[PDB]
């Protein structure tokens, strides 16, 4: 009776893509997936699901198939499928004006352009919806984004990345744990 929550990782389909950057949002929900014993499982909406309970509560993880660009046509659908609200989302994504190692947590935003964000934004009519949003560094310029987010972590950045990976679970948990969002922004900000 408590709802549920949908966490929503963004990313590109494929092994062309799983570990380039843009994909940070798929780690980081394949991360908690692993957390709690969950499988993704392939669903009617274009997606990945893996599902787990907390206290009573299905938290859902989900990892749309449908390219970055395209990712609402996975997100809105789910919501009407499962009956979930734009305050039940906690959409995770890769930030191209944070460094490496940072995460932010913010509830509302157009994420400079991001095309995922976008999409969402575009399917649910609004740009109102709980994200963390995970560094992975600023490029040099307009010219170097796509190559910048369409390539791996450095082999030094690594350990970077895993940590705010980490705090990325840990955000996770103490919203599923009933914590306030607004609370978990004063936490992990
Ligand atoms: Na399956
Ligand atoms: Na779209």
Do not use: W
């Not at 963004?10 to 940070?24: D, R």
């Not at 890769?94 to 157009?110: E, F, N, T």
């Not at 964000?117 to 010219?143: A, M, Y």
């Amino acid at each position: 009776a408590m709802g549920m929550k949908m966490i929503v990782g963004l990313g590109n389909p494929g092994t062309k893509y799983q570990y380039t950057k843009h994909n940070i949002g798929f780690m980081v929900v394949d991360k908690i997936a692993r957390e709690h014993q969950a499988t993704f499982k392939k669903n009617p909406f274009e997606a990945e699901v893996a599902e787990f309970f907390h206290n009573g509560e299905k938290i859902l993880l989900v990892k749309p198939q449908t390219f970055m660009n395209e990712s609402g046509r996975a997100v809105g659908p789910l919501m009407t499928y499962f009956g979930i609200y734009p305050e039940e989302l906690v959409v995770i994504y890769d930030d191209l004006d944070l460094a490496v190692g940072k995460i932010r947590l913010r509830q509302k935003g157009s994420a400079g352009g991001h095309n995922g964000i976008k999409s969402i934004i575009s399917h649910l009519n609004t740009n109102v919806f709980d994200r963390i949003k995970v560094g992975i560094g600023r490029p040099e310029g307009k010219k170097t984004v796509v190559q910048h987010v369409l390539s791996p972590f450095s082999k030094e950045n690594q350990p970077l990345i895993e940590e705010s990976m980490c705090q990325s679970v840990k955000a996770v948990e103490y919203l599923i744990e009933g914590h306030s969002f607004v609370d978990a922004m004063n936490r992990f900000n």
